[PDB]
Amino acid sequence: SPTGLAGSLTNALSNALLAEDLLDTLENLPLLDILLGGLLGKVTSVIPGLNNIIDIKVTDPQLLELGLVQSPDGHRLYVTIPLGIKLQVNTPLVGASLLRLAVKLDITAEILAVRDKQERIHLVLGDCTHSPGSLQISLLPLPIQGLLDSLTGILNKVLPELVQGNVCPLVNEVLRGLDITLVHDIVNMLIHGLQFVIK
């Protein structure tokens, strides 16, 4: 089980994210709510209608194995966080299954060490974004295509930033809380541009 920094880093990050309930965060995404044609929305709220009429359940929260890359100059790290969820598109009113979807996405987190004016070194989360072009949607009686088009269209434009804004704060929290010695050895080796991530 004991190993060098890179391996300790990815295991420590994985455990910590899960222990901060990453999988509840994913499960609880306000996917629906953050959302003519647009008059229709105003209509169904003026009538005692059963709402919305559409509902989306997020299930099957999944964190996959972290990946890790160190920059050429050895000063910076990039952690890839591969995430997976299932979306179940239901209509309450008829009360039936419309769609089940698998979605997969990557967060990239940029880790660097930087030295303040008083010779101290800090572990800093630099960038933290959805990885462009990493979104993947996959369909798991009725013609249903209608949905699956302005639904993968919505998801394309809405899901990355929602996940990013939900998962990156967690990533920030897990960095601050790493083992003190694992932090100190990692900042010491990035700041002196010494390679340790092997591949």
Swiss-Prot record:
One of its GO terms (molecular function) is lipid binding. One of its GO terms (cellular component) is extracellular region. Keywords: Antibiotic, Antimicrobial, Disulfide bond, Glycoprotein, Immunity, Innate immunity, Lipid-binding, Secreted, Signal. The keyword Ribonucleoprotein does not apply. Induction: Up-regulated in response to all-trans retinoic acid (ATRA). Up-regulated in tear fluid of patients suffering from dry eye disease. Up-regulated in response to the pro-inflammatory cytokines IL1B and TNF, and the bacteria E.coli and P.aeruginosa. It comes from the Eukaryota. The keyword Nuclease does not apply. May be N-glycosylated. Changing residue 128 to A: No effect on surfactant activity. Disulfide bonds join 128-168. Highly expressed in lung, upper airways and nasopharyngeal regions, including trachea and nasal epithelium (at protein level). Specifically expressed in the secretory ducts and submucosal glands of tracheobronchial tissues (at protein level). Also expressed in the eye where it is detected in lacrimal gland, eyelid, conjunctiva and cornea (at protein level). Specifically localizes to epithelial cell layers in cornea, eyelid (basal epithelium) and conjunctiva (at protein level). Detected within acinar cells and ducts in the lacrimal and Meibomian glands (at protein level). Its main location: secreted. Changing residue 34 to C: Forms an artificial disulfide bond. Reduced surfactant activity. It is found in: Secreted. One of its GO terms (biological process) is innate immune response. Residues 36-40 are annotated as: Important for surfactant activity and antibacterial properties. Monomer. Interacts (via N-terminus) with SCNN1B, a subunit of the heterotrimeric epithelial sodium channel (ENaC); this inhibits proteolytic activation of ENaC. Belongs to the BPI/LBP/Plunc superfamily. Plunc family. This is BPI fold-containing family A member 1. It comes from Homo sapiens. The chain holds residues 43 to 255 of 256 of the full protein.
